[PDB]
Amino acid sequence: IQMTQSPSSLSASVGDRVTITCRASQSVSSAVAWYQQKPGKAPKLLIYSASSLYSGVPSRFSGSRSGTDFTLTISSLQPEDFATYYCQQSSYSLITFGQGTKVEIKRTVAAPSVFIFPPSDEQLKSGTASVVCLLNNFYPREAKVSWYVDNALQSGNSQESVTEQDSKDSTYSLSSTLTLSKADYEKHKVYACEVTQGTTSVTKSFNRGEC
């Protein structure tokens, strides 16, 4: 039984009304629960039996069932309630959860500061060269990073990592790392990190053995 959860993510403001839905794959009766989890802490039981409030949880929380549609709602979102939420069904014996609903903070758009880092000479001793591109404090999350070595667009030799939303300005920051062989790096010259985010494209570049 697949608990399909929607949406995967959304951004609202404090005081927004917020609704998270979860649709069972076959009828689970009303045997459903809701949990909240904040990073590095265990889940907290929020709603049990689709609609009944667990004792101690705030009253802006509530749930509801219509057929196989289970819904969680916060009537007026408070800062403490920014987290990830999970539904659960407990029918018969095999337990399944929803994929997750990350509830993030809305803020104004922001372009990233784009910084590029050539490999260090220490690293080349190991025979591998790492080029790092940093996209700093932007909103919202969506960003494309393209890598160009001597004008040749790379694929397969980069990886990206994104921070969670910042605890103060509610931006994201992303890094991309292009991994080349030492030999491959020392035969080419111009290394570029092209960033597209929002209505903004930024290219940062260096030539091997520069400065």
């Binding site: 039981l45 039996s49 667990y54 784009v114 590029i116 990592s161 994104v162 921070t163 890094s175």
Partner: protein, 221 residues
């Protein structure tokens, strides 16, 4: 006080065996259903196994059947998850939780199960500021921590004095099986000649400490 204290987690080799403990105090254990649910780093919640209070009829998730074994003992009032034929998919924090009102009320703190073939300490490389790292009065610098296994590495800057502007990214799995991450900080450009910047990398499974003073790229000509 009803307490759910977990133990037994640690590093383990593939197709091996490790035992987690879910010590229950306060309540009787054989009076409520008990479940293990796990969470691979950066992923969702996955139920693993359950044990019934009367006559200890057990049920497991399809993914773990026949490899994991759940057991209980009322003498110690603790439930165990014996994990056998351990896979890399099993790397996760494992929680234990008690069933109450068709769901799960109390939880353990969670113990980490880290699968691993061999332990690798990290190489740490500077991400040096330069004219290709300086925009709008701000210079970026950082530390590249590469080729370690398994997690975690923790990064601080200047022993925790430097905290604002810091970004330590989630670790990524390189196609080599070894982990890699970077920790960066943005600082005012003028500070580059006023302050030293040191990243403090800590990788407990290899008992490696590294401290890297990150300096502006020295120009050869």
């Amino acid at each position: 006080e009803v307490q759910l204290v977990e133990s037994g987690g640690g590093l383990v080799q593939p197709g091996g065996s490790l035992r987690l403990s879910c010590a229950a105090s306060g309540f009787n254990l054989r009076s409520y259903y008990m479940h293990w649910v796990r969470q691979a780093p950066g992923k969702g919640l996955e139920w693993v196994a359950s044990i019934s209070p009367y006559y200890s009829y057990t049920y497991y998730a399809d993914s773990v059947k026949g490899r994991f074994t759940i057991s209980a003992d009322t003498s110690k009032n603790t439930a165990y998850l014996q994990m056998n034929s351990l896979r890399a998919e099993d790397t996760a924090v494992y929680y234990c939780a008690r069933h109450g009102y068709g769901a799960m009320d109390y939880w353990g703190q969670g113990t980490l199960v880290t699968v691993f073939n061999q332990i690798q300490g990290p190489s740490v490389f500077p991400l040096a500021p330069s004219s290709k790292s300086t925009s709008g009065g701000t210079a970026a610098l950082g530390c590249l921590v590469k080729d370690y296994f398994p997690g975690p590495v923790t990064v601080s800057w200047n022993s925790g004095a430097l905290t604002s502007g810091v970004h330590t990214f989630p670790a990524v799995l390189q196609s080599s099986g070894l982990y890699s991450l970077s920790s960066v900080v943005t600082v005012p450009s003028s500070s580059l000649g006023t302050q030293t910047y040191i990243c403090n990398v800590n990788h407990k499974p290899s008992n490696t400490k590294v401290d890297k003073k990150v300096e502006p790229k020295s120009c050869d000509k």
